[PDB]
Amino acid sequence: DLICAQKFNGLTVLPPLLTDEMIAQYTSALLAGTITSGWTFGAGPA
Amino acid sequence: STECSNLLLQYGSFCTQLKRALTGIAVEQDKNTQEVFAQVKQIYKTPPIK
Amino acid sequence: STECSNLLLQYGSFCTQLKRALTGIAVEQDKNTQEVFAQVKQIYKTPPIKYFGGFNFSQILPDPSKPSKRSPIEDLLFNKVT
Amino acid sequence: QCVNLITRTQSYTNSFTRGVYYPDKVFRSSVLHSTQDLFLPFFSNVTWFHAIHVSRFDNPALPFNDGVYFASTEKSNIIRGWIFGTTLDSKTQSLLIVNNATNVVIKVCEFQFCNDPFLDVMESEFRVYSSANNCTFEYVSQPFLMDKNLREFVFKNIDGYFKIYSKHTPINLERDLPQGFSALEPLVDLPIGINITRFQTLLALHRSYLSGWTAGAAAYYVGYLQPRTFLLKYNENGTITDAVDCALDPLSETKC
Amino acid sequence: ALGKLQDVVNHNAQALNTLVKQLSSKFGAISSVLNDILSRLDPPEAEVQIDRLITGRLQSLQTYVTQQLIRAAEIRASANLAATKMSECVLGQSKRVDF
Amino acid sequence: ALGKLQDVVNHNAQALNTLVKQLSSKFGAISSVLNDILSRLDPPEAEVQIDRLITGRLQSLQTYVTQQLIRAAEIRASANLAATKMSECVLGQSKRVDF
Amino acid sequence: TGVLTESNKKFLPFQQFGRDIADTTDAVRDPQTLEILDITPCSFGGVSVITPGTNTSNQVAVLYQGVNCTEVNVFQTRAGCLIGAEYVNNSYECDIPIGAGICASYQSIIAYT
Amino acid sequence: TLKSFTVEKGIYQTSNFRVQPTESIVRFPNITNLCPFHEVFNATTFASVYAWNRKRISNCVADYSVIYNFAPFFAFKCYGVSPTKLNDLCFTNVYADSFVIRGNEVSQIAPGQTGNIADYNYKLPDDFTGCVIAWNSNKLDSKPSGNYNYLYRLFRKSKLKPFERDISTEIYQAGNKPCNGVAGPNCYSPLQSYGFRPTYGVGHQPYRVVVLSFELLHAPATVCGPKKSTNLVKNKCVNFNFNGLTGTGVLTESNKKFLPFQQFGRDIADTTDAVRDPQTLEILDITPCSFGGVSVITPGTNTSNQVAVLYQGVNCTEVNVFQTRAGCLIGAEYVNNSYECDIPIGAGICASYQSIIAYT
Numbered sequence A: 001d002l003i004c005a006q007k008f009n010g011l012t013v014l015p016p017l018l019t020d021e022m023i024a025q026y027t028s029a030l031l032a033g034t035i036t037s038g039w040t041f042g043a044g045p046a
Numbered sequence B: 001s002t003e004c005s006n007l008l009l010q011y012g013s014f015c016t017q018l019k020r021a022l023t024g025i026a027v028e029q030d031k032n033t034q035e036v037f038a039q040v041k042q043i044y045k046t047p048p049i050k
Numbered sequence C: 001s002t003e004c005s006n007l008l009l010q011y012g013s014f015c016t017q018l019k020r021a022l023t024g025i026a027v028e029q030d031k032n033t034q035e036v037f038a039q040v041k042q043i044y045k046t047p048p049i050k051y052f053g054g055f056n057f058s059q060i061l062p063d064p065s066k067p068s069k070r071s072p073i074e075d076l077l078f079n080k081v082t
Numbered sequence D: 001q002c003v004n005l006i007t008r009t010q011s012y013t014n015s016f017t018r019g020v021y022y023p024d025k026v027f028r029s030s031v032l033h034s035t036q037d038l039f040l041p042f043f044s045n046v047t048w049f050h051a052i053h054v055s056r057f058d059n060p061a062l063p064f065n066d067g068v069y070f071a072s073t074e075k076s077n078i079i080r081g082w083i084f085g086t087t088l089d090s091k092t093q094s095l096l097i098v099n100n101a102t103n104v105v106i107k108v109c110e111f112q113f114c115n116d117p118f119l120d121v122m123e124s125e126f127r128v129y130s131s132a133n134n135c136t137f138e139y140v141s142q143p144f145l146m147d148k149n150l151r152e153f154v155f156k157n158i159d160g161y162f163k164i165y166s167k168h169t170p171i172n173l174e175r176d177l178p179q180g181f182s183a184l185e186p187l188v189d190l191p192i193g194i195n196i197t198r199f200q201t202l203l204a205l206h207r208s209y210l211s212g213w214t215a216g217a218a219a220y221y222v223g224y225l226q227p228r229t230f231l232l233k234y235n236e237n238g239t240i241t242d243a244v245d246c247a248l249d250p251l252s253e254t255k256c
Numbered sequence E, F: 001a002l003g004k005l006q007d008v009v010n011h012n013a014q015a016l017n018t019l020v021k022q023l024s025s026k027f028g029a030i031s032s033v034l035n036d037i038l039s040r041l042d043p044p045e046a047e048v049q050i051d052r053l054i055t056g057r058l059q060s061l062q063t064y065v066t067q068q069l070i071r072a073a074e075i076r077a078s079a080n081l082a083a084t085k086m087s088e089c090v091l092g093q094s095k096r097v098d099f
Numbered sequence G: 001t002g003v004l005t006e007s008n009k010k011f012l013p014f015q016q017f018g019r020d021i022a023d024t025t026d027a028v029r030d031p032q033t034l035e036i037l038d039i040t041p042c043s044f045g046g047v048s049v050i051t052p053g054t055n056t057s058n059q060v061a062v063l064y065q066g067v068n069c070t071e072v073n074v075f076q077t078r079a080g081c082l083i084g085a086e087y088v089n090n091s092y093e094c095d096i097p098i099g100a101g102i103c104a105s106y107q108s109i110i111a112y113t
Numbered sequence H: 001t002l003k004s005f006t007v008e009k010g011i012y013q014t015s016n017f018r019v020q021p022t023e024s025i026v027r028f029p030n031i032t033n034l035c036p037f038h039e040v041f042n043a044t045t046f047a048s049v050y051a052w053n054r055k056r057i058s059n060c061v062a063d064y065s066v067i068y069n070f071a072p073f074f075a076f077k078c079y080g081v082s083p084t085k086l087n088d089l090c091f092t093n094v095y096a097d098s099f100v101i102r103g104n105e106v107s108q109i110a111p112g113q114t115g116n117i118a119d120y121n122y123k124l125p126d127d128f129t130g131c132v133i134a135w136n137s138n139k140l141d142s143k144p145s146g147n148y149n150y151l152y153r154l155f156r157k158s159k160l161k162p163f164e165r166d167i168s169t170e171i172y173q174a175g176n177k178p179c180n181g182v183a184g185p186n187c188y189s190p191l192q193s194y195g196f197r198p199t200y201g202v203g204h205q206p207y208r209v210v211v212l213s214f215e216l217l218h219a220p221a222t223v224c225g226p227k228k229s230t231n232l233v234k235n236k237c238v239n240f241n242f243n244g245l246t247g248t249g250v251l252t253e254s255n256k257k258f259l260p261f262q263q264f265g266r267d268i269a270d271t272t273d274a275v276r277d278p279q280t281l282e283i284l285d286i287t288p289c290s291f292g293g294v295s296v297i298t299p300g301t302n303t304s305n306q307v308a309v310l311y312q313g314v315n316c317t318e319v320n321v322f323q324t325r326a327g328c329l330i331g332a333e334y335v336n337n338s339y340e341c342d343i344p345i346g347a348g349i350c351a352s353y354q355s356i357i358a359y360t
């Protein structure tokens, strides 16, 4: 009921632009780059 | 309350200031996420045989 | 208005606090510029023959033609910020 | 001598961006000023009236609402003024504005108005009203119907004062309500203090001398003002050259 | 283990909760409800009571926005540090001790 | 391209404009002009009206100083970063990734 | 002012009103008939306008933040109801951020993941 | 300023220099007509509260001092303006509203008041400015058998608007049954007369109420006080009074093409850029007088007691004089020789003690 009470008085929580799935996908991309390519992918081509 | 809004209008651009500040914080949070996580422009994938 | 100032005196050292805070910000800005740019105590100058083994630095070195003594890139930067 | 001579037909057109006036008497130059006032909304429904007299009562009295935008493409001699009031008889006060070639007479009395009032041309007001008693206001000044030419007026009745705004435009080979901006300028503020709920336009008719009056036509546009917030652009010389209606569409709301 | 993120969530929720609690403060007026003031008081005194409520609520909202700005600055500094760690620890090998 | 620097100029000018614009706010008083209040009212009630104007303008000025302090902290952090880049990228070669 | 929905809350016989954690009324007992109603205030939303430059076009889209589409080219997003943009299954870079992974661009105005 | 007897080396902001105005100029309309307050306040008969009399006052110069000089006005209460300052102001929208009410109803002639005559007879707006005058009229508006000439609207369907008069003598329906214009059970006439008798004590005696209504500065003014117009002076810091508008500034010629209706000129921030005068229809551009901050550049009091002053953002011709971009520096001698910065002045200029020198 905390969220509803805050919402009723004009306070709104805007959703984050990047969802949890997309942030997880970014971490997955960083892990794949660091595992298969080492540090090369951060400085140019993987 | 319409009367309250009419009285509130006498105070000027306080409401505009507060909306602008919160909007700046709101865009800043998304910018923070882009800075930390969106550091690669290629979505790399692991090989199937891990 | 003198009457307004007389009534303003009842609120105390709010005016002094605001002036002190703004003064701190004002000196801080000069300190920021000193910290970023004044990191060398010798004003080095480039040799008159600008040959560096094929490397061209005309766009970043100061332009003698301009009265402002700025580089072409710096001149562009100053024009583009208003 | 009240005679019914005018028949009136009506169509509906678009206001476009007509009807902007100077909201106050303050010079503002090269600024964007947002004001909330009684304005004619952009692209609002405006009634086009054609009044024809050929040589029964078919010229009803229009409501006033919160203020009236008036426009005409006719010459200065056909439309000669207006009538404002509630009951339009001797029991309540009424405002009669009559223009002629030399000056304008604005007069608030207890007129017993005719059902189809018109000034007939010397000029006689015996066909406008039958009696005028207990007259409480008179104001004579230079006329605002002078000499293709679009004539725009804004009438407001706010807190005792009848405010009249006017603009003239050299229109040509375009629909009578043209595009672009022509801000109306404050012409007179009259301390009237009467109740106005209905209004009617005055036309001039010529005697025939041969079907007692010469056949004629007059076309005019009537729109109604609404409480609206506008954002006006004041240019280098203080002229309102552009405006956005803050509540017309989301794009203009974003601009506002 | 995950106290830092939980603290961030807790502080944000607590600030919102406090801001809602501020609506139930009279601030030196007869009532904290605008409807009660409108229904029980004529406009001369109603303007004064709503003025007291407006100034108190506006001060509360300004306080909340200021706290949010300071916390946003702190989180921005933490995010800049996190981006620096992502660049220097994940995308490369760092010779900085304890970074 | 030069959006960051222009943004700083934009914020500062806008803040000053807001601070100037707040002078046209009645703040619950009869007028926003002090000369009118003095020319129109007796000192017992003019003192009240001037008090309302003083508290509103003082609150506006404190708000402006607070946001100036927060922006000063943000610009100071950016300047410290710029000094670090000048020391490590210009005056030497850096092995920090993406710095 | 609010909607009065059916309530599953079992009041004790002496209680008349009901309150939230944040001390806001969330329930009420009807005086005429002893029944419990969940007072829920009417829907509100933050109207946001999505537009490209006026130099390019004058078409706009409206996002009602937090509002389901049934309570207001209508698309439902987690951010709210987006009216005036057509969802495209193609994925592009973000041009105008909408939220929850949705971004908008002008090509008409399209919304995409 | 520093609250210490020892001042360390540096530059300190101390005060603000501002050039003071030299003389006060009052500009008022030349037209002088004695204002007819005698007609309104000394009338033998006043109107009833339902049909209250409104008289417009315009195009006159009003001397309110005589209102005080002769005055049976038991109540003289002003809402938006001081009584003694009325002679110093210019007004438009002046209206005198005269009516007769009860002794106890004088509290209801106020903004926001709850009453019978407040709702159905005479309504005041919430933002009303002006003065309410109330005085006992037992000697003139009372008769021993009962003076019933004054009537009030007891019944009406809805409350009135501000400054609206209702004189319609139609019946009111007070019950479920329609009345159809005929009196009878639960059908009463709206207008009832007051039973004014001299035998009653104060509080029920007939009271004559006159409401003076004004508007403040939102239109060109036509009613002014007895203040005399002074001549206009150009290019000097003066404290001017244009139609009740007081300001301190320099009045200069303007090249702004004002429209004929326009008087006031406003800049981007609504600051009054220019003004037009009623007596002479000419546009005077208004510019605030020269001012700036004063900074005291001083070495330590341990070293010396010499000081230099910097007027920030002020050219040297409006106050060892050196002109810098920071402002005008008084007390330091510019030296071509370049040294390190000791006391920062600004724009590349620094000051030091060697006398106090200023250098790049």
Ligand SMILES: *[C@@H]1O[C@H](CO)[C@@H](O[C@@H]2O[C@H](CO)[C@@H](O)[C@H](O)[C@H]2NC(C)=O)[C@H](O)[C@H]1NC(C)=O
Pocket: C056, C057, C058, C059
């Ligand atoms: C270094 O670069 C500059 C500019 O990039 C070169 O200057 C150009 O010279 C050519 C031929 O002389 C002209 O057509 C261009 O207009 C010049 N550009 C500018 C911006 O002036 C210069 O030739 C290069 N080489 C050296 C040795 O300075």
Ligand SMILES: *[C@@H]1O[C@H](CO)[C@@H](O[C@@H]2O[C@H](CO)[C@@H](O)[C@H](O)[C@H]2NC(C)=O)[C@H](O)[C@H]1NC(C)=O
Pocket: D100, D101, D102, D103, D105, D122, D123, D140
């Ligand atoms: C135009 O209107 C003016 C004003 O009503 C007329 O001038 C008046 O004429 C009457 C004659 O009936 C005189 O008694 C007034 O003294 C005049 N007043 C003014 C201000 O001049 C004028 O006659 C009208 N002209 C026409 C052609 O109708």
Ligand SMILES: *[C@@H]1O[C@H](CO)[C@@H](O)[C@H](O)[C@H]1NC(C)=O
Pocket: D012, D045
């Ligand atoms: C204008 O009003 C008439 C009737 O009042 C209506 O039939 C017509 O559709 C309206 N015009 C527009 C453009 O909506």
Ligand SMILES: *[C@@H]1O[C@H](CO)[C@@H](O)[C@H](O)[C@H]1NC(C)=O
Pocket: D133, D134
């Ligand atoms: C209005 O006229 C009628 C008849 O001419 C008269 O009885 C009445 O008193 C008049 N009223 C005013 C206010 O002049």
Ligand SMILES: *[C@@H]1O[C@H](CO)[C@@H](O)[C@H](O)[C@H]1NC(C)=O
Pocket: D086, D087, D195, D196, D197, H161, H164
């Ligand atoms: C104005 O006149 C109309 C028509 O008789 C009437 O219904 C209305 O109440 C009047 N307005 C006021 C404020 O008296």
Ligand SMILES: *[C@@H]1O[C@H](CO)[C@@H](O)[C@H](O)[C@H]1NC(C)=O
Pocket: D235, D236, D237
């Ligand atoms: C404004 O006035 C100047 C000077 O009379 C004139 O040259 C110019 O055409 C006018 N209009 C605009 C839009 O600048």
Ligand SMILES: *[C@@H]1O[C@H](CO)[C@@H](O)[C@H](O)[C@H]1NC(C)=O
Pocket: G031, G032, G033, G034
């Ligand atoms: C009140 O009246 C309603 C309607 O007749 C009825 O249902 C109810 O039982 C009554 N009593 C109480 C205690 O509500």
Ligand SMILES: *[C@@H]1O[C@H](CO)[C@@H](O)[C@H](O)[C@H]1NC(C)=O
Pocket: H038, H042
């Ligand atoms: C007021 O009227 C009385 C008669 O009632 C008269 O004697 C007196 O001279 C008048 N005074 C003024 C100032 O008109």
Ligand SMILES: *[C@@H]1O[C@H](CO)[C@@H](O)[C@H](O)[C@H]1NC(C)=O
Pocket: H029, H030, H031, H278, H279, H280
């Ligand atoms: C008096 O003022 C009027 C404007 O109200 C002006 O037209 C007139 O010229 C002035 N008289 C003199 C003698 O200047």
